[PDB]
Amino acid sequence: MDIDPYKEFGASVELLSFLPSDFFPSIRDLLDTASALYREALESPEHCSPHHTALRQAILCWGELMNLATWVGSNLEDPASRELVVSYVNVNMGLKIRQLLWFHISCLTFGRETVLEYLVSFGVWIRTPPAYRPPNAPILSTL
Amino acid sequence: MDIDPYKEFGASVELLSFLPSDFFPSIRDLLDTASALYREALESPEHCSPHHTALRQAILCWGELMNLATWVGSNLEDPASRELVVSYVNVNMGLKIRQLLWFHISCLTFGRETVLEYLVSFGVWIRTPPAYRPPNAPILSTLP
Amino acid sequence: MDIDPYKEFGASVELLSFLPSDFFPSIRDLLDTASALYREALESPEHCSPHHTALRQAILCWGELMNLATWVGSNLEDPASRELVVSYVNVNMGLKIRQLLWFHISCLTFGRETVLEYLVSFGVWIRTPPAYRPPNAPILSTLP
Amino acid sequence: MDIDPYKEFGASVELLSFLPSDFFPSIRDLLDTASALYREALESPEHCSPHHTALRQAILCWGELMNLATWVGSNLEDPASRELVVSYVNVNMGLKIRQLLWFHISCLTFGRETVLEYLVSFGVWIRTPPAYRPPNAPILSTL
Amino acid sequence: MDIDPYKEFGASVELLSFLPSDFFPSIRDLLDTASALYREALESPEHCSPHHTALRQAILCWGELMNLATWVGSNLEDPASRELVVSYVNVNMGLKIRQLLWFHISCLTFGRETVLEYLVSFGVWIRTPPAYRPPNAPILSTLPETT
Amino acid sequence: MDIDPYKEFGASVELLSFLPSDFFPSIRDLLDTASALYREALESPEHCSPHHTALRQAILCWGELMNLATWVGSNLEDPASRELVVSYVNVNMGLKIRQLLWFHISCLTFGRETVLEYLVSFGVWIRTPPAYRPPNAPILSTLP
């Protein structure tokens, strides 16, 4: 079956594909801003928010992916083949978990209606050619 | 942060450790149960339950892991180290979503309080010495 | 004084003698059931039930017996008489807390009246001649 | 898991660790004052008190420890190794069952609020050096 | 800043200097006393008293001093100069917080005015010559010695 | 007894480790602004705040640590121990006293909620890639 993870939150993969690769902070920097803002709500028996439920799964999805890269570096025989796998988890599979971590942290920080309104205006900006756009990208921090 | 995937739903990792490792059905058998029973709701544009939201992320977590096992199939021309990676995803990494898929499919079908009471009742069954346990295990089939 | 540990809870030593000796699960299997199900309450600063108060003393009684078996491990340099002591605590002394841990975990999970009725119902089952008893024993799994 | 046996009664192991070893009577003298004061309440099907439930377990804990020392003296081969075990049950494991027997007998005799108020004032007295304390320890017998 | 830890609570350093140096119990004996009676309050998410706010920093002051003495042991390969620093942390720096732990535990247990009247009455007792001094020193027990 | 020094003030060690380590002003500058702004209120027979009660103990803790450093500089014959100990006391304990002094001085100056919001905002600002944040770092300021 075909599930996009954002459709229950009012977005799509097509809406978040306009953000470039160097728009999201690193995965260590998304896990730090969740552990420092919402830790008593993520380590809680309550449901709190639907953005809290999807953020708990995205953290433990990465904790098993960092569990994989520790296994790959420990018990593969040749070092040549193991350097493609750990580079795949951090870069290729790590990019999909950044925008999952970015979307749910920002929907808790700024609001869900603000992030969806920002993703429209960022899509207009990056679809415009660089000669006909303002030089600075729009930012989020309304608060 | 030591975050618990089942504490939100009134369970724990140590309560899910009452069931053995080779008790959960395979991932292909659990994704067909999700397809046949809950496909209009997992593809719905609204979250219907907290179990649906944790189940949509559990399928995409396995979908990311199947793009990985396809990638190690197409790459890593050393053949002896390719089979170490793709069998790790299918066996070792596939287990921790297999408890995650089993817990959320069964809590959508039978309810929260039925699966939590089944987790205790399977705890009594596997604890009993083999001279005094029944030959049948408990099944979640509360429905006729 | 000939004091009865289960008479307070509506049972007796001779009603607990309906179950055989090798029916109760091991002490490591019963302390994990107490850990997974009742750890906020056994470490609570208030007594929640008379079964909690008798269960906190049953765990500390085994905790005193494990400091003893560690002490006979570190001391008693005669090796033939060290193994007589530590196997007595694990097998012989560990049994009378194993009925004590089983009775209070099961009475917190299923209730008093369910375990007392299970003690009678297991009495009928073990009494029946083997030509006419079922191949299944009763389990306390009243919960689905 | 980590349980202290006194926390449900409003005390701790840290509160009762200030009482010295020679503060409690012998285990035969704690079992005599329970069998002579509360025997119709300990040999009873009722719950009576939470101090009664914890006292029933502490008596039968010692009855299995005296069962052990009878076994050790009967069927160990050498007498040299058996004299360390029976001295361990009576002294080392016997000291932990004295303060369990003392705390629950005294909470029934004087009251729970009196024993906790006495354990504070006995802690002030024995933490004071002997040159700056009164020479007599405080006593319990308010009745 | 000529600042004073007890001046806020109605005392002084010199009023705490009535008690001698070898009067306060050891740091292990006040940490066991604090954790016995005040552990849900010293780890509470709110401040309960100015004694609780000042006792949380005094335990944290001792915690930073014990990670220091641990660090001097794992490092500092000269044994002649290592042991005199760990001795300075334990017996010299620990004395200034033993008065801080004793003062704030006792004002939580018996009250501010009871400890402040005890410091005066122990001041009369210790400056009396030993020929005219009574045998039983003052003590801030809430119960009498005969109960 | 595990006590968080900022827990009663609505923060934690994790929220103050959210900012980088070389952000907090030095211990000399923080004691300078404490002695400039709040000296008649820290040398006072009143409490006036929980922040004043914590700031006095922080200043006295740093005074005891500087007495320690003066003592180690006074009498230790090993020159490498004078290189190790008083550099540890500065660069490892002064960072924690820098966070404590900065937190309490800023909470006295700007308010507690403004300092907590500034902690969250500056952490998320540092974490953000530089092309998608405001170009200059935020400060607390009382000047309109």
Numbering used by the authors:
A (entry chain B), D (entry chain B): 1 to 143
B (entry chain A), C (entry chain A), F (entry chain C): 1 to 144
E (entry chain D): 1 to 147
Authors' account:
The roles of RNA sequence/structure motifs, Packaging Signals (PSs), for regulating assembly of an HBV genome transcript have been investigated in an efficient in vitro assay containing only core protein (Cp) and RNA. The 3200 bp long genome encodes four overlapping reading frames for polymerase (Pol); surface proteins (HBsAg); the cell regulatory factor protein X; and the core and pre-core proteins (HBcAg and HBeAg, respectively). Pol and Cp proteins are translated from the pgRNA, which also serves as the template for reverse transcription within the NC shell. We propose that they act as Packaging Signals (PSs) helping to ensure faithful encapsidation of the pgRNA, by analogy with the mechanism regulating assembly of many bona fide ssRNA viruses.
